[PDB]
């Protein structure tokens, strides 16, 4: 069972900078007969299957850009992006087709550093359709920001909420290097209309002050 | 030309069995390496099984004796009959190819399938509830309006959300679902359109939940 | 007066593939007639094109016993066979090679050598077994990190058999890599190992050209 180890676990560099992905194998990937190294490099954009970028350690497949290149011979191998672009934001696994079980690496998440982008905040009150069922889910939206670190606090009549709101973040867009965040505040029907003011407050680097969007009915 | 169409996934109870299929076109499956590679949600890739040459089979020790791989040349298809499925088998399984030249050395995975999800649970499927995220002045910061849909209360993963039957792709952001305390899933898929096209353009988010055979088409209109 | 090999290849011919028992070596030929995978038990034949060039035209060709089976190998079992080399519904092995295994649960350190007294060039061949798992590396050679050293006055190389489970060929998960050399008149070749050695059983003395 060959153990494929990658380094680092997450790589974030500026647009056009130079990024290296290092993969150390638990055993030599070379054959005594010839001189070809059975290591492969794959790309996996979010929501897509893996995509083979490099085989035989160094050789690229058709359609793969030239800025990608694989080096190494023996137990130490390297993927390198000379000029990192926007559509390169993806996870990269090194995998050996030397012996079986065929094993991949842990993965290397590559991210783009850019200018500080401030998010645009919008709030959605629960539709009358959901309220009739007996549940209230208020959604606070954060379209495009950078970096991904963002704090979303819910206020129900100036009451800091905790234990009833849930959020999920989109992975980095492979064009403009943004992320997106939505927080779903799940309340019951009896506690939604018992109150009035609901507001999601957002603190971020690009925001000089915590921004708050709010509706008032309910 | 070289595609890999997968089918056979869904929800199965622990101990149950399920059969995965991989339709192929562009190469002969009896003359190339065919492999299964699963990926647990939020985890690294993992190889599973292969079939090659005169239908010789290798397996990973984690699924050996429980899974059986096979193929059918007249149908040009790859199969992975799964037996005694456990909770840790919950993963998206992928279909893989390799150029079997001399058959002496292995090959990587050059062409892949789009992935089908197998959920090992016993909670049984339940239909998602879709609610309009209607835009207004509270969701209009400037010359752009924000609207979406709230696909709530379903099991298991996944759901596919499109807008206007796929004719709206610019600015659409569908977010990963969240598992709430009840045990069901819920997500929201939004889209940023210019606020001038609100009264003129109709907007329909299109959600499909295969494990429950549910298909919902919700219109979103301003409040 | 060229050679006629028929079904067998030079790899099959020179290694002694049991499917080639019909072929008897005649002293000389100008050129070889092949019908080319000849390796019974799969593996890489090193410098196969180089060997076919040396064997194109020969004179004074001879096939002699280089390392006797029942004497050169004390404290080692030599009757190792395999089903990939079947001979009339029964497992066998190359007729010019011996596949050395354990004896009484022991693979002692190995040493043996040959002195070229034939006054001609002696073609010497050997192989290196590459098993498919660690378990069968210990069960046959009792050492995980085996070494093989072939040294002569004109060729010195040291092999490390690596454990790798390759795709099945002839229904076998492991390989044997084949190697050869030419021994000048008056030269001595020395084999040392502690596992994974396919020692020579017969060898060929020949006048090249
Ligand atoms: C193979 O076995 C031993 C290996 O040394 C050779 O000599 C024996 O050595 C062991 C201790 O290592 C003792 O039992 C005796 O000193 C030896 N026993 C005998 C019977 O010789 C032995 O000679 C080798 N086999 C042959 C056929 O020579």
CA distance A108 to A9: 5
Cis peptide bond prior to A80, omega within 30° of 0: no
Closest residue in A to C178 (Cα) is: A33
d(CA B43, CA A9): 13
Q: Take residue A34 and report the two structure tokens written for it.
A: 């010839």
On the question of a common fold for B3-120 and B129-220, the answer reads yes
Spatial separation of the C-alpha atoms in residues B119 and A174, rounded to whole Å: 29
User: Would you call C90 an interface residue with chain B, using a CB distance cutoff of 8 Å?
Assistant: no
* Pair C177, A33: CB distance under 8 Å: yes
CB-CB contact of B130 with B178 (8 Å) = no
Return the SS3 of B8. coil
Q: Give yes or no on whether A4-113 and A121-215 have one common fold.
A: yes
Determine how many CB atoms are found less than 10 A away from the CB of residue C153: 12
Q: Counting every residue, how long is chain B?
A: 223
Q: Which residues of B touch A122 (CB under 8 A)?
A: 138-141, 146
Phi, psi torsion values for C137, nearest 5 degrees:
-75, -40
- d(CA C35, CA C37) in angstroms, rounded, equals 11
Q: Provide the b/e sequence for B134-157 (b: ≥16 CB within 10 Å).
A: bbbebbbbeebbbbbbbbbbbbbb
How is domain A4-113 classified at the architecture level of CATH?
Sandwich (2.60)
Phi/psi for C138 (5° steps) reads -75, -35
Six-digit token pair at A164? 């009833």
Give the alpha-carbon dihedral of B134, B139, B145, B146, to 10 degrees: -60
Element of type H or E holding A214: strand A211-215
In chain B the beta strands, taken as DSSP E runs, fall at: 3-7, 10-12, 18-25, 33-39, 45-51, 67-72, 77-82, 91-98, 116-120, 129-133, 145-154, 160-163, 172-174, 178-179, 185-193, 204-209, 214-219
Q: Architecture of B3-120 per CATH?
A: Sandwich (2.60)
Q: Which two tokens stand for residue B40?
A: 């647990």
Q: Does domain B129-220 have CATH number 2.60.40.10?
A: yes
Alpha-carbon distance A50 to nearest alpha carbon in chain C (angstroms) = 23
Residues 6 or more apart from B156 whose CB is under 8 A from it?
B11, B117, B119, B121, B123, B125, B185, B211
Q: Domain segments of chain B: what residues? A: 3-120, 129-220
- Beta strands C188-193 and C110-115 are antiparallel
- Give the resolution to one decimal, in Å: 3.3
Which residues are registered as beta bridge partners of A23? A6, A77
Q: Which of residues 10-39 of A touch B (CB under 8 A)?
A: 31, 38
CA C152/CA C48 separation, integer angstroms? 20
- Residues after which chain B is broken (C–N above 2.5 A) are none
Ligand 1 site, residue C105, Cβ cutoff 6 A: no
> Do the Cβ atoms of A21 and A28 come closer than 8 Å?
no
> For residue A27, what is the nearest residue in chain C, using CA coordinates?
C162
- Is the Cβ pair B105, C167 closer than 8 Å? yes
List b or e across A172-200, with b for residues whose CB sees 16 or more CB atoms inside 10 angstroms: bbeeebbbbbbbbbbbebeebeeeeebbb
Instruction: Report d(CA B45, CA B38) in Å as an integer.
Output: 6
Closest CA to B40 of B207, B188, B173, B157: B157
**HSE-CB for C191 with a 13 A CA cutoff:** 27
Within 8 A by CB and 6+ apart from C90, the residues are none
Q: Is the CATH number of domain A121-215 3.40.1260.10?
A: no
Q: How far is B146 from chain A (nearest CA, A)?
A: 7
Residue C74 Cβ inside 6 Å of ligand 1? The answer reads: yes
Q: Of A190, A77, A95, A59, which is closest to residue A135 (Cα–Cα)?
A: A190
Dmax of chain A from CA atoms? Answer: 78
Q: Which of C171, C179, A98 is nearest to B105 (CA)?
A: A98
Give Dmax over CA atoms of chain C in angstroms.
50
Instruction: Determine, for residues C165 and A33 on separate chains, whether the beta-carbon distance falls below 8 Å.
Output: no
d(CA C145, CA C137): 9
SS3 at position C183: strand
For chain A, domain boundaries = 4-113, 121-215
Where do the H-state alpha helices sit in A68-174?
Answer: 128-133
Cα(B50)–Cα(B73) distance, rounded to whole angstroms? Answer: 15
Verify whether the Cβ–Cβ distance B139 to A143 is below 8 Å. no
For chain C, how many helices (H) and strands (E)? Answer: 3, 13
Q: What tokens were used for A116?
A: 């500080």
CA distances from A163 to A122, B45, B205, C158 (A): 22, 33, 30, 67
Determination technique for this entry: X-ray
Backbone angles phi, psi at B197, to 5 degrees: -90, 20
Q: Which helix (H) or strand (E) holds A192?
A: helix A189-193
By Cβ distance, the residue of A52, A122, A167 closest to B146 is A122
Tell me the residues of chain A between 83 and 142 that have a Cβ less than 8 Å away from chain B. 93, 95, 97-107, 120-127, 129-130, 133, 135, 137, 139, 141
Residues ≥6 apart with Cβ < 8 Å to A164: A185, A186, A187
A202 closest CA partner among A129, A144, A153: A153
Token look-up 């089918």 returns: B7
Q: Is C20 helix (H, G, I), strand (E, B) or coil?
A: helix
Residue of A nearest to B132 (CA): A127
CB nearest B108 (choices: A40, A123, A170): A40
B73, exposed or middle or buried, with CB in 10 Å at 0-12, 13-18, 19+?
A: exposed
Other beta carbons within 10 Å of A52 = 21
d(CA A131, CA A37): 61
Kindly state whether A170 is in contact with chain B, defined as any CB-CB distance less than 8 angstroms.
yes
């Amino acid at each position: 069972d060959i153990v494929m180890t990658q380094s680092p676990d997450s790589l974030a560099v500026s647009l056009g900078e130079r990024a290296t992905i290092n993969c150390k194998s638990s055993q030599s990937l070379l054959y005594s007969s010839r001189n070809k190294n059975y290591l492969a490099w794959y790309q996996q954009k979010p929501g897509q299957p893996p995509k083979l970028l490099i085989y035989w350690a160094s050789t690229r497949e058709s359609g793969v850009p030239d800025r990608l290149s694989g080096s190494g011979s023996g137990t130490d191998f390297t993927l390198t992006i000379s000029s990192l672009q926007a559509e390169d934001v993806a996870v990269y696994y090194c995998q050996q087709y030397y012996s079986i079980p065929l094993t991949f690496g842990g993965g290397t998440k590559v991210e783009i550093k850019r200018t500080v982008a401030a998010p645009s905040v919008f709030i959605f009150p629960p539709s009358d359709e959901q309220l009739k069922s007996g549940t209230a889910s208020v959604v606070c939206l954060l379209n495009n920001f950078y970096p991904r670190e963002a704090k979303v606090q819910w206020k129900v009549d100036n009451a800091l909420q905790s234990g009833n709101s849930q959020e999920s973040v989109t992975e980095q867009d492979s064009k403009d290097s943004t992320y997106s965040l939505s927080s779903t505040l799940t309340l019951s029907k009896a506690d939604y209309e018992k109150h009035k003011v609901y507001a999601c407050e957002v603190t971020h680097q690009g925001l000089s002050s915590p921004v708050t969007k709010s509706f008032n009915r309910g | 030309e070289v595609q890999l169409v997968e089918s056979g996934g869904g929800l199965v109870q622990p101990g149950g069995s399920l059969r995965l299929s991989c339709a192929a076109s562009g190469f002969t499956v009896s003359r190339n390496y065919m492999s299964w590679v699963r990926q647990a949600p939020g985890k690294g890739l993992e190889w599973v099984s292969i079939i090659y040459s005169g239908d010789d089979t290798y397996y990973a020790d984690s699924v050996k004796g429980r899974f059986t791989i096979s193929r059918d040349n007249s149908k040009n298809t790859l199969y992975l009959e799964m037996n005694s499925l456990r909770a840790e088998d919950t993963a998206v399984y992928y279909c893989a190819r390799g150029e079997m030249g001399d058959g002496y050395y292995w090959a990587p995975f050059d062409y892949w399938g789009q992935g089908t999800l197998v959920t090992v649970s016993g909670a049984s499927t339940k239909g998602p509830s879709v609610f309009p995220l209607a835009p207004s002045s509270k969701s209009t910061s400037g010359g752009t309006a924000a609207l979406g849909c709230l696909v709530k209360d379903y099991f298991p993963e996944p759901v596919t959300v499109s807008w206007n039957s796929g004719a709206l792709t610019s600015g659409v952001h569908t977010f990963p679902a969240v598992l709430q305390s009840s045990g069901l899933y819920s997500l929201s898929s939004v889209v940023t359109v210019p606020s001038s096209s609100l009264g003129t353009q109709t907007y329909i988010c299109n959600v499909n939940h295969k494990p429950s055979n549910t298909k919902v088409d919700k219109r979103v209109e301003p409040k | 007066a060229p050679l006629q090999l028929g079904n067998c290849s030079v790899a099959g011919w020179i290694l002694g593939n049991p499917e080639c028992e019909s072929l008897i070596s005649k002293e000389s030929w100008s050129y070889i007639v092949e019908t080319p995978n000849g390796t019974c038990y799969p593996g890489y034949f090193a410098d196969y094109e180089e060997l076919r060039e040396q064997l194109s035209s020969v004179s004074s060709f001879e096939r002699f016993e280089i390392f006797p089976k029942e004497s050169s190998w004390p404290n080692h079992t030599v009757t190792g066979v395999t089903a990939s080399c079947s001979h009339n519904g029964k497992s066998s092995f190359y007729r010019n090679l011996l596949w050395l295994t354990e004896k009484n649960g022991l693979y002692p350190n190995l040493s043996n050598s040959y002195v070229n007294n034939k006054e001609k060039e002696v073609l010497v061949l050997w192989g290196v077994h590459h098993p498919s798992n660690i378990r069968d590396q210990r069960a046959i050679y009792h050492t995980e990190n085996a070494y093989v050293s072939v040294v002569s006055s004109h060729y010195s190389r040291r092999f490390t058999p690596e454990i790798a489970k390759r795709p099945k060929v002839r229904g076998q998960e492991g390989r044997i890599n084949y190697y050869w050399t030419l021994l000048e008149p008056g030269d001595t070749i020395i084999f040392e190992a502690n596992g994974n050695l396919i020692a020579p059983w017969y060898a060929f003395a020949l006048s090249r050209g």
